[PDB]
Amino acid sequence: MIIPIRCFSCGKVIGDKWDTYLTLLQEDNTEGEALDKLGLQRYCCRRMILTHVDLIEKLLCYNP
């Protein structure tokens, strides 16, 4: 459910860096490589936005 915020290995904040991420791999014709434009030189955490599942859009639609 939603980006982890703070990568698992370092501290590099990733809560901020997704509302902007998704607006490239599906909205700018840049590669998975495009995240490099977000200051992701380390492995590391950058496999954080990448290996992530958006499990809330598909959970939020159960309205009580």
User: In the set 1, 9, 20, 50, which binds Zn ion (CB under 5 A)?
Assistant: 9
Per CB under 5 A, 5 contacts Zn ion: no
Report the first-to-last Cα separation within the chain, whole angstroms: 19
Residue span 12-51 as binding mask against Zn ion, x where in contact by CB under 5 A, dash where not: --------------------------------xx------
57: left (phi over 0), alpha (psi -120 to 50) or beta: alpha
Q: What is the closest distance, in whole angstroms, from the C-beta atom of residue 61 to Zn ion in the complex?
A: 32
Run of H or E including 10: none
Binding interface with Zn ion (CB under 5 A): 7, 9-10, 44-45
